[PDB]
Amino acid sequence: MEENTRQRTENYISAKNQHPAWILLATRRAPLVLSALKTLFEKSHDG
Amino acid sequence: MEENTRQRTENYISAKNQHPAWILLATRRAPLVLSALKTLFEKSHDGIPLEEAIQSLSSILIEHVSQEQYDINQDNPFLQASRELREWIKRRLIVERDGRIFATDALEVAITFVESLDNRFMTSTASRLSTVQREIENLETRLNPNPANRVATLRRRISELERELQEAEAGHIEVLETHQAVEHIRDVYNLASSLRADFRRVEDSWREADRALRQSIIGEQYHRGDIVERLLNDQDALLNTPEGRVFDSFQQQLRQSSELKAMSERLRVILSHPSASDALNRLQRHDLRWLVKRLVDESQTVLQARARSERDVRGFMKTG
Amino acid sequence: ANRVATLRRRISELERELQEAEAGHIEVLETHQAVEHIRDVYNLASSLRADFRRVEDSWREADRALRQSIIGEQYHRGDIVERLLNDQDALLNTPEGRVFDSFQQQLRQSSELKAMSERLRVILSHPSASDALNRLQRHDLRWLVKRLVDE
DNA sequence: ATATATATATATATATATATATATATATATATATATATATATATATATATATATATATAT
DNA sequence: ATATATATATATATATATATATATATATATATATATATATATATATATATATATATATAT
Numbered sequence: 076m077e078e079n080t081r082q083r084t085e086n087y088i089s090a091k092n093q094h095p096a097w098i099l100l101a102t103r104r105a106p107l108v109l110s111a112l113k114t115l116f117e118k119s120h121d122g
Numbered sequence: 123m124e125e126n127t128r129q130r131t132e133n134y135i136s137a138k139n140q141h142p143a144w145i146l147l148a149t150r151r152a153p154l155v156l157s158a159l160k161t162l163f164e165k166s167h168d169g170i171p172l173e174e175a176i177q178s179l180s181s182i183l184i185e186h187v188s189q190e191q192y193d194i195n196q197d198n199p200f201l202q203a204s205r206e207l208r209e210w211i212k213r214r215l216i217v218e219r220d221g222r223i224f225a226t227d228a229l230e231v232a233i234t235f236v237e238s239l240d241n242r243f244m245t246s247t248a249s250r251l252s253t254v255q256r257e258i259e260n261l262e263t264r265l266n267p268n269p270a271n272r273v274a275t276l277r278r279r280i281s282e283l284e285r286e287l288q289e290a291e292a293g294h295i296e297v298l299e300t301h302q303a304v305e306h307i308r309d310v311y312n313l314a315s316s317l318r319a320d321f322r323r324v325e326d327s328w329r330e331a332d333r334a335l336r337q338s339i340i341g342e343q344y345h346r347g348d349i350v351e352r353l354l355n356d357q358d359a360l361l362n363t364p365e366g367r368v369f370d371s372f373q374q375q376l377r378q379s380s381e382l383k384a385m386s387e388r389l390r391v392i393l394s395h396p397s398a399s400d401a402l403n404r405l406q407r408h409d410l411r412w413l414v415k416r417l418v419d420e421s422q423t424v425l426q427a428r429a430r431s432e433r434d435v436r437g438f439m440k441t442g
Numbered sequence: 443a444n445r446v447a448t449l450r451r452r453i454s455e456l457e458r459e460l461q462e463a464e465a466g467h468i469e470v471l472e473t474h475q476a477v478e479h480i481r482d483v484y485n486l487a488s489s490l491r492a493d494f495r496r497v498e499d500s501w502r503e504a505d506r507a508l509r510q511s512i513i514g515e516q517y518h519r520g521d522i523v524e525r526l527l528n529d530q531d532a533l534l535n536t537p538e539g540r541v542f543d544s545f546q547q548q549l550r551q552s553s554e555l556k557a558m559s560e561r562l563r564v565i566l567s568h569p570s571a572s573d574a575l576n577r578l579q580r581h582d583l584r585w586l587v588k589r590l591v592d593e
Numbered sequence: 594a595t596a597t598a599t600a601t602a603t604a605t606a607t608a609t610a611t612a613t614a615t616a617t618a619t620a621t622a623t624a625t626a627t628a629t630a631t632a633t634a635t636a637t638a639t640a641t642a643t644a645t646a647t648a649t650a651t652a653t
Numbered sequence: 654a655t656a657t658a659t660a661t662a663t664a665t666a667t668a669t670a671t672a673t674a675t676a677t678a679t680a681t682a683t684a685t686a687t688a689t690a691t692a693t694a695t696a697t698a699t700a701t702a703t704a705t706a707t708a709t710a711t712a713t
Contacts, residue, residue, distance in 0.1 A: 076404070080161055081185055087153035090239050097239060101148050103626065103684085106134035114127050117578055120589070150624075150686065193687070201614090208615085243537050246493040248544035254486050255558050261483060262561040265476060265568055269468045276460045280453065287449040295445050305540060368478050 142214045143228035147235070154192055155210070158182050159225070160233050164405060167416060168423065169222035179203040219427070227322040234319075247309040248302070300397055307392065307401035311410050321420050325427050327365035331356060332431040339438050346439045353435050373421060386414045473570060480565065480574040484583055491586070494593045497538045504533045545590060559587045 091097055099105055138144055146152055161182050162175065170178075180203035187194050195202040207223075210216050216223050238245065263275045289295070298306060335356060360366025376382065392398065393411055402410065409416075462468070471479060508529055512522060533539050548555050565571065566580050575583070582589070 080182070083160070084153060084157040084186060084189075086240055087157050087236060090236065091153045094239055097147065097236075100144065101152075105148075106138045107131060110127065110131040110134050114124060114130070118124075120582070120585070205615090241496075244493045244496060244541070245489040246541060247537065248540040250486070250490055250493075250541075251544060251548060254483070254490065255554060257483055257486065258558055258561045258565070261476075261479060262564050264469075264471055265565060267468060267470045269463060269466070272463045272468050273460065276456055276463060280456050280460065283449060283453045283456065287446070287453060290445045290449060301540065305537070364478065367474070371475070371478075 141228065142226070143232040143235075146213070146215060146228070146232055151192060153236075154186065154189070156232060156236050158186075158206075159210075159216075159229060160237075163225050163229075163233075166225070168419060169219060169224035172218065172221050172223055175223055176200065176203050176207060179207060225322070227320075227326060230319065230322060243308065245312060247305040247312070249306045249309040253309060253313070300400075303395070303397045304401045307395075307398060310392070311402055311406060314410060314413055317413070317417060318420070321424055324365050324369045325424055327360060327363070328428045328431055331360055332434050336434065336438065349435060349439055356431070369424075373425075376417060376421065382414055389413065476568070476570045477574045480571060483565075484575060484579055487583055487586055491589055491593070493538060493541055494590060497542050498593065500533060500536065500538055504529050549591075555587055562586070 091101075099108065102108075138148075146155065149155070158179065162170065162179055165178075177200075180199040183194065183199045183202050183206070186192075187196060187199065190196075207216070211218060211223075215226060215229055217226055263272070266272075297303075335352070357366055357370070361370065389410060393407060398407060470476075508526060511517065511525060517525065534543060562584055566584050571580055
C-alpha cells in the first residue's frame with residue numbers, strides 16, 4: 076500500500092500542473108469565468 | 123431565469139474568498155497538503171486522536187522530506203507535524219473536539235474533488251443504471267395515491283415474483299458472473315460511502331443556528347416563554363431546512379435495529395465472497411465491513427455535539 | 443434454497459402490501475419525504491452522464507492511438523487488424539467499457555428504458571418536483587435517457 | 594470522656610528567573626496576470642487577366 | 654449542306670495594397686508565499702510565605 080502513499084503526491088502534483096479544471100480554479104480570475112460559462116451552458120443542452 | 127446571474131458572480135467571488143476548500147485548492151502548496159491530509163484521514167473512524175495525528179503526520183512528512191522544493195523541514199519532523207497541524211486548524215481546515223481532531227466539510231469537498239479529478243475507477247459502475255431503474259420504479263409506484271395503480275403494480279410485481287419462484291424451484295436460478303458481481307460490489311461501496319458525506323454539514327448547521335439564536339438573544343427583552351417553545355422550534359426550523367429534517371429522519375430510519383441487523387448480516391456475506399477482494403482493497407473492505415458501527419458512532423457523536431445547543435437554552439433563559 | 447426462501451419471504455411482503463392496498467390502506471410518501479426522495483434520485487443520476495463524459499475520452503484516445511500506429515511502418519495488414527481488434531476489446535473490458543456495454547444491453551431490452559422514462563415523466567409532473575429541483579435539473583432528469591442515447 | 598486550642602506538619606500558591614514554543618509585523622523572493630510590441634493572417638477593395646461559352650464569318 | 658475557327662462577351666480567378674485582428678514574445682507591476690526579529694505564552698527548578706491541617710496541649 077506504501078506506493079499509494081507517495082505516488083499519490085505525484086499524481087496530485089501532475090493534476091495541479093496539467094488538468095484544466097484545477098488550473099482554472101487556481102487562477103486569480105476564476106469565479107467570473109466559471110459563472111459566465113455556467114450561465115452560457117445551463118440554458119441549452121445540445122451545444 | 124437569468125436575473126440572478128448578477129448575484130451569482132457575487133456569490134462565487136464570496137465563495138472564492140471565504141470557503142476554505144476553494145482557497146486551499148488555490149494555494150501554491152495545495153497538492154502536498156491535500157495528499158498529506160488524505161493519507162492521514164484514510165484511517166480515521168472517529169476523529170483521529172490528536173497524539174496519533176501528530177505522530178502519523180510526522181511519519182507522512184518524513185515520507186516526503188525528499189521534496190526540498192516545498193521548503194520541507196530537515197531537523198525535526200515531529201515539530202514540523204505539530205506546526206502544520208496547528209496551521210491547518212487555523213485555516214478552518216481541521217477542528218479539535220474532545221482532543222480528537224476531525225475533518226471539516228471543506229476538506230471533504232476538496233478531497234472528493236481532487237480524487238474524482240484524475241483517471242481512475244469511475245464514480246458510476248455498470249450497476250448504477252440498474253440501481254437508478256429500481257429506485258425510479260419504487261418512487262413512481264409510491265408517489266401516486268391512485269389505489270388502482272398501486273394494486274395493479276403489486277399484481278404485476280407478484281406475478282413476476284411468482285414466475286421467479288417457479289423458475290428457482292425448478293432449478294434455473296441465475297447469479298452474477300464474476301465481472302458483473304465486482305461492478306455491483308463497487309457500486310454498493312460507492313453508494314454506502316456517501317452516507318458519511320454529510321455528518322459534518324449537519325453539525326455546522328447546528329452551530330450556525332445556535333450562534334444566530336444567541337446573537338439575536340442580545341435583545342434580551344423578548345419573552346422567555348417564546349423560548350420555552352423555541353427549544354423545540356430550533357429543531358423544527360432546521361426541519362424546514364434539509365439539514366435538521368433529513369438528519370432526524372435518517373436517525374429515525376437508522377434506529378430500526380431490525381433492518382440494520384439485516385444490512386449487517388448481508389454486508390458480512392457479500393464481503394466474504396471471493397470477488398470482494400477484487401472489487402475492494404484491504405482498506406475499503408474493512409471500512410465497509412463495519413460501516414454500521416461507523417454510522418452509529420458518528421451519529422451518536424453528532425447528537426452529543428448538538429447537546430451543547432440543547433444546553434444553550436439554560437445559558438439563555440437563566441439570569442440568576 | 444437461499445433464493446427460494448428469499449422469494450418466499452419477499453412474495454409475502456408484497457402480499458402484505460397488496461392486502462393493505464386492497465383494504466384501502468394505500469400510503470403515499472409524506473409530502474415532504476417525497477421531496478428529498480426525489481433529489482436523491484437526481485443525485486444518483488448526476489454521475490451517470492459524468493462517467494459517459496470519460497467513456498468518450500477513452501474511446502477518443504484509443505482511436506487516436508490506432509490512427510497514429512497506422513502511420514507506423516512496422517505493422518503488416520494482419521498486425522493492424524489485430525491492433526484494432528485488441529485495442530477495441532481492451533477498451534471494452536475496462537470499467538467505463540463495462541458501463542458502455544451495460545448501456546448497450548439495456549438498449550437491446552429497450553422496454554425497461556422506455557418504462558424508466560415514462561416513470562420519470564410521471565415523477566416530474568408531481569408538484570413536489572418543483573420544490574425539490576429547479577427547472578433546469580428537472581429538464582435534465584427528464585431527458586436523461588435522451589442524453590445518454592445521444593452521448 | 595469530649596471540647597477548646599496549641600506548635601508544628603501537609604502541602605501548596607505564589608514568586609522569580611530561565612528556557613523553549615508560538616504569534617505577530619515586517620521584509621524579501623518567486624509566481625503570476627497583464628500591458629506593450631512585431632510579424633502574421635483575414636478580409637476588404639481595385640484592377641487585370643484567364644476562362645467558358647457564344648456570335649459570326651469561313652472551309653470543304 | 655455540316656462543321657471549323659476567330660472575335661466577342663461575361664463569369665471567375667489572380668495580383669496587389671490597406672487596414673484590422675492575431676499570435677508570440679518581452680517586460681512590468683502585482684500578489685503569494687517564506688524568512689526573520691520580536692514579543693508573549695507555556696512550562697520548569699528553586700524557594701518563600703501562606704492557608705489548611707495534623708497532631709496536639711489544654712480544658713470542663
